[PDB]
């Protein structure tokens, strides 16, 4: 087509979605991790994760307001990944890289899994 | 902080939100324009428009599944703007610029209003 494009549009949309998350506006699901609860928007979770995409496209699960993750999932690893989903920023540190990579593998967040694999390989 | 950032994350999220819109997945509102109906996600509309932000933060309106726009609003102008919200691409043409700018002013989409004003000024 002959469209023009606003370069900062996608980033501004994500920034606004994160502001709604902060203020708990229109959040429609609670993700439960080892008794730690995280409120979020189903569509953002689906847009970022192959696991949430599969969960919320399921005819029965799409209607759930609570999702319980596998007990092996670390709440801090999940929190870091939830923050990444809403900001594009990943708080990756020596002390959390193993939990973050394991959580990203479970959530099916391929780009995060890739950078964790590379950062781990650099330290060996 | 000491975060790393995935450059294409915001764009990939918006692309996935547009794929959900195409497949009518988790859309939670119908926008009615001169008897033309558009299905969308309330959070994306809020993230892009000052008008939808005000509508869906209202305690009564946040719960509506149908929103009727002012009858002076042109459905094609709205369609072009809805496409922009989900893609960052604006199909701006000599034949639609007046309807697009009027719709962007009503929806409170300041960056769109700005480029329409500039494109109109160039033709005078």
């Amino acid at each position: 087509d002959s469209c023009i494009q606003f370069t900062r549009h996608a980033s501004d949309v994500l920034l606004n979605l994160n502001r709604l998350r902060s203020r708990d506006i229109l959040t429609d699901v609670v993700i439960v991790v080892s008794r730690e609860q995280f409120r979020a928007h189903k569509t953002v979770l689906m847009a970022c994760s192959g696991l949430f995409y599969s969960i919320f496209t399921d005819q029965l699960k799409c209607n759930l307001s609570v999702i319980n993750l596998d007990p092996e999932i670390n709440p801090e690893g999940f929190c870091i990944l939830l923050d990444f989903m809403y900001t594009s920023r990943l708080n990756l540190r020596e002390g959390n890289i193993m939990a973050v990579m394991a959580t990203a593998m479970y959530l099916q967040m391929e780009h995060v899994v890739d950078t964790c694999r590379k950062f781990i390989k650099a330290s060996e | 902080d000491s975060c790393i950032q995935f450059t294409r994350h915001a764009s990939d999220v918006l692309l996935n939100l547009n794929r959900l819109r195409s497949r009518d997945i988790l859309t939670d509102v119908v926008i009615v324009v001169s008897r033309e109906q558009f299905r969308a996600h309330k959070t994306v509309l809020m993230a892009c428009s000052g008008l939808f932000y005000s509508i869906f933060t209202d305690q009564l309106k946040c719960n509506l599944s149908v929103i009727n726009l002012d009858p002076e609003i042109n459905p094609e102008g709205f369609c072009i703007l809805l496409d922009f919200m989900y893609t960052s691409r604006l199909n701006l043409r000599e034949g639609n610029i007046m309807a697009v700018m009027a719709t962007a002013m009503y929806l409170q989409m300041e960056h769109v209003v700005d480029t329409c004003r500039k494109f109109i000024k160039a033709s005078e």
Partner: peptide
């Protein structure tokens, strides 16, 4: 704004 840019030409994509």
């Amino acid at each position: 704004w840019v030409i994509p």
